[PDB]
Amino acid sequence: TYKITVRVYQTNPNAFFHPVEKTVWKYANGGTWTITDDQHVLTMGGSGTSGTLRFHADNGESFTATFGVHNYKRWCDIVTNLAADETGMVINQQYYSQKNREEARERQLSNYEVKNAKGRNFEIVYTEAEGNDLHANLIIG
Amino acid sequence: TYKITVRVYQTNPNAFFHPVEKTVWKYANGGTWTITDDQHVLTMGGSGTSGTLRFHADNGESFTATFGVHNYKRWCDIVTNLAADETGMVINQQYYSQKNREEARERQLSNYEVKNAKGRNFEIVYTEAEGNDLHANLIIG
Numbered sequence A, B: 001t002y003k004i005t006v007r008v009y010q011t012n013p014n015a016f017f018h019p020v021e022k023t024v025w026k027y028a029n030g031g032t033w034t035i036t037d038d039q040h041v042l043t044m045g046g047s048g049t050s051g052t053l054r055f056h057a058d059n060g061e062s063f064t065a066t067f068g069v070h071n072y073k074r075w076c077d078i079v080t081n082l083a084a085d086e087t088g089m090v091i092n093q094q095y096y097s098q099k100n101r102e103e104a105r106e107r108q109l110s111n112y113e114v115k116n117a118k119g120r121n122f123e124i125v126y127t128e129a130e131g132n133d134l135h136a137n138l139i140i141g
């Protein structure tokens, strides 16, 4: 099995985001999201699956942060500027169906950042990027 | 918009279930899960969508509880005996794809109960079952 422990950092008091969805994809015997010590913990049955966290702010901004294991290495991706019909479960499935999202996963990134239309930065960084017990920060700008 | 507030009652100390997944379907401008006063609150952009909570126990038992609004009337369903590849996002989608799940939604039930293979009962009952501010109890046997 693989475990990914996520710590969320909010750095900019001009907005406040909260988690509104937590999904788990069906490959590699699936998995489970839980919370321990204010950390989001994803456990997976093997290499080849993932889970998505969707966040929303009161001002309308939202994004997905997805974490998983591809070919025995960690991966991550962030999607911003979400339409109302782009929920976390939609985004999670797209990593296994939609070519551009598939490629984002196959890159096996231990770090990724991107801005939304308003210019806000979002970053995922793995502070423990090796082995089966993986650790990442999600930093909101 | 519609809101469904869910209260979880675990009545049997021979096991402990916890939420491991919360999904939101893409119709009716989607929506959001949040937590207020230890309650799971699903907000939806209108009539015509739903969200799924998946629970897992340490003994291997698991189930999904799905809540939504269909043509302005609330609905619910429970699926038990989940395989490893039947995650919450898989089940949530099946209510708009698969015949027996679709029919469950169309029944617009204000209460439903079912047993798993081990004989444990699970029930959903809406205690506020009309209007836009709906309240439901999820009762684990």
Ligand SMILES: CC(=O)N[C@@H]1[C@@H](O)[C@@H](O)[C@@H](CO)O[C@@H]1O
Pocket (backbone or CB within 6 Å): A027, A028, A047, A048, A049, A069, A070, A071, A072, A096
């Ligand atoms: C060992 C491993 O990572 N296997 C995965 C598989 O489970 C699946 O995610 C696929 C993409 O659909 O890529 C790889 O074959």
Ligand SMILES: CC(=O)N[C@@H]1[C@@H](O)[C@@H](O)[C@@H](CO)O[C@@H]1O
Pocket (backbone or CB within 6 Å): A077, A078, A079, A080, A081, A100, A101, A104, A114, A115, A116
């Ligand atoms: C601005 C934005 O959200 N860009 C995302 C990018 O971060 C990446 O996730 C890609 C593949 O999924 O899709 C979108 O282009």
Ligand SMILES: CC(=O)N[C@@H]1[C@@H](O)[C@@H](O)[C@@H](CO)O[C@@H]1O
Pocket (backbone or CB within 6 Å): B027, B028, B047, B048, B049, B069, B070, B071, B072, B096
């Ligand atoms: C107003 C309303 O509830 N409309 C829904 C629609 O959104 C969709 O969920 C469909 C399911 O196939 O059923 C109803 O037509």
